[PDB]
């Protein structure tokens, strides 16, 4: 299997009391957010509440998506987990509130005795019906059909045929939603049927999209922020960054000497955590060319010369601004 940016993440790495171990299940540090996410895992597993929402807020590269995906590993594959980005609502076929409602219905599961289906699957199955060769266009499924599907699902649950599995919606990049989308989430989050929601945002005091210079904290209006519980993620220390760089090396199947690892951590103190982690695979490939099987400080140094980080490149654009295009 191919290695992804969150392949190392296996769970929240909490002990039996819910307190976060310093390094467990691929995560390192960030104990307060990991402990808070453990409470949210217990909220989802209880299956009692509906529509409760949380927001992961912090600087970039501080594990907001890793925490959300760590929650998904804790729940398992039985529980539905519907990831999305905020920019997916801008569909050319259906309105934006339909795209949110479709994603919300995807996050409520149903085990029918065996079939694993979502409420969205029952909606689209019953929405569609002889000349059925046109383009499969999505449609704005009405609340009447969704009301009827809810009644049928309750009848099968009372008959003992179906088992409800309330899951999780994960709206990463929630600032990409506009004011119409945010206001629609008030109705969606207040429903007795709705799933648990996890928002993630890295903005601070930016204009809400679709308004006219209405700045709000994060990128979310204060109306929606009143309806959510914010979980804060901190920056990582150099030692925490070094541990994270080490875990990514074992995930990518890369041997790195301690002197190289210290240099990558020093490169990690400048630049970003993401930049130093990205140098591991080019450094390993460069080591394999030299006729070597391990990365050496000089392999990390040469890759740093070849590949520029964001701040280093911005200095070139600032100095050579007349040469570059506007």
């Amino acid at each position: 299997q191919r290695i992804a940016s969150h392949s190392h993440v296996k769970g929240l790495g909490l002990d039996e009391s819910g307190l976060a171990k310093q390094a467990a299940s691929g995560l390192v540090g960030q104990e307060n957010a990991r402990e808070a996410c453990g409470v949210i895992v217990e909220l989802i597993k209880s299956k009692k509440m509906a529509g409760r929402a949380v927001l992961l807020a912090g600087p970039p590269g501080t594990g907001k998506t890793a925490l959300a995906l760590a929650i998904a590993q804790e729940l398992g594959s039985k529980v539905p987990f519907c990831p999305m980005v905020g920019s997916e609502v801008y569909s050319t076929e259906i309105k934006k509130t339909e795209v949110l409602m479709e994603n919300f219905r995807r996050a409520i599961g149903l085990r029918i005795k065996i079939q694993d289906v979502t409420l969205h699957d029952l909606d689209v199955a019953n929405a569609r019906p002889m000349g059925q060769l046109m383009k499969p266009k999505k449609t704005e499924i009405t609340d009447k059909l969704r009301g009827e599907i809810n009644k049928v699902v309750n009848k099968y649950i009372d008959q003992g045929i179906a088992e409800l599995v309330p899951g999780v919606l994960f709206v990463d990049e929630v600032h990409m939603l506009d004011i119409e989308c945010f206001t629609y989430l008030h109705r969606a989050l207040e429903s007795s049927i709705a799933p648990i929601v996890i928002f993630a945002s890295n903005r601070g005091n930016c204009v809400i999209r679709g308004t006219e210079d209405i700045t709000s904290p994060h990128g979310i209006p204060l109306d929606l922020l009143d309806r959510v519980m914010i979980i804060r993620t901190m920056l990582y220390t150099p030692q925490e960054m070094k541990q994270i760089i080490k875990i990514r090396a074992q995930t990518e199947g890369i041997n790195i000497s301690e002197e190289a690892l210290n240099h990558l951590g020093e490169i990690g103190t400048k630049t970003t955590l993401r930049y130093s982690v990205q140098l591991l695979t080019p450094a390993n490939l460069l080591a394999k060319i030299n006729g070597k099987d391990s990365i050496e400080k000089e392999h990390v140094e040469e890759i740093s010369e070849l590949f520029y980080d964001a701040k280093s490149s911005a200095k070139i654009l600032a100095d050579q601004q007349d040469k570059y295009m506007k």
Binding site: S17, A50, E93, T183, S192, L235
Partner: protein, 332 residues
């Protein structure tokens, strides 16, 4: 067993909690305080059951978290399933398959029931419009994709239903359209509502907003709720007030009872301090979290330490805005 309906934000609301004289009780049917707005909601509720006056418009204005949506669920619970109660967000009219006026027309027509005797069948005016719009149009009631239904279809059904009412075959049950967050409507939508309310087939229009003197969407004019003054002249406004210390505690007691959470008396006092400070919604959100933390330590009653623990773990908006400001230029 886990049914499709679970403990939501307004699940404890089981009516308006009024006597026969529409006098609100202090604590009844999940509602707490807010006596002037609940009394006004009772008067509007008796108007809806009367069903004689068409196109009556009411706005529920008030600060956020003052029970505007709680009152509207209170009216919907008290009215029962027989009378239609169409509930929409303001942003739902912005459709790709149909115009804003068509979306508002369908919402108006959905809120008018027709009991037709063959045995009784209950169908709204919107259902009859869609079925007559095209061959096997009843697919479109579920899938959407109705398109813009022609004016001649709705005029013919208006005369046909009026014929059946005079014959006594049909009976018309006018319902409610509740547009929560009505400030999301634009000036073209509000102008359509001015003449849509003047029709004799129109339902009772409840609306809710928390906006001050703000810009109307689609224009650059300030107006007292984001709503133009011409529509506001056609309205009666119901004002919900913010809650006192005792009303906040009573609301938290009912939510604890709804969620099946036991808390000590000191926990009710201290989480209340956190709430009168931050917001009512934040204090409600800490009930289930503190119950889970108390459950993790094998306790049975939520204590003050559980409230302080979840207070530290989960930030309200005011505190989270402060930590972001001390990390200015880290956030994008």
């Amino acid at each position: 067993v886990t049914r499709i309906e679970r403990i939501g934000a307004h699940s404890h609301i089981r009516g308006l909690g009024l006597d026969d004289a529409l006098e609100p009780r202090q604590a009844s049917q999940g509602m707490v305080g807010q006596l002037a707005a609940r009394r006004a909601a009772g008067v509007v509720l008796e108007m809806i059951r009367e069903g004689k006056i068409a196109g009556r418009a009411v706005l529920i204005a008030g600060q956020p978290g003052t029970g505007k949506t709680a009152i509207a669920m209170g009216m919907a619970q008290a009215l029962g399933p027989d009378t239609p109660f169409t509930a929409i967000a303001g942003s739902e009219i912005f459709s790709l398959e149909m115009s804003k006026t068509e979306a508002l027309t369908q919402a108006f027509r959905r809120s008018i029931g027709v009991r037709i005797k063959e045995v009784v069948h209950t169908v709204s005016l919107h259902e009859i419009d869609v079925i007559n719009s095209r061959t096997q149009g009843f697919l479109a009631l579920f899938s959407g994709d109705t398109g813009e239904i022609k004016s001649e279809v709705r005029e013919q059904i208006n005369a046909k239903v009026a014929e059946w009412r005079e014959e006594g075959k049909a009976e018309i049950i006018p319902g409610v359209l509740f547009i929560d967050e009505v400030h999301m409507l634009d000036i073209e939508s509000f102008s359509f509502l001015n003449r849509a309310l003047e029709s004799d087939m129109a339902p009772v229009l409840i609306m809710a907003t928390n906006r001050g003197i703000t810009r109307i969407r689609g224009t650059s004019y300030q107006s007292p709720h984001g709503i133009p003054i011409d529509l506001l002249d056609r309205l009666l406004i119901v004002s919900t007030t913010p809650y006192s210390e005792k009303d906040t505690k009573q609301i938290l007691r009912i939510r604890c009872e709804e969620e099946d959470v036991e808390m000590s008396e000191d926990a009710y006092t201290v989480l209340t301090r956190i709430g009168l400070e931050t917001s009512l919604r934040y204090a409600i959100q800490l009930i289930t979290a503190a119950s889970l933390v108390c459950r993790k330590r094998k306790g049975t009653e939520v204590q003050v330490d559980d409230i302080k623990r979840v207070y530290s773990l989960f930030l309200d908006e005011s505190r989270s805005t402060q930590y972001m400001k001390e990390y200015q230029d880290a956030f994008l």
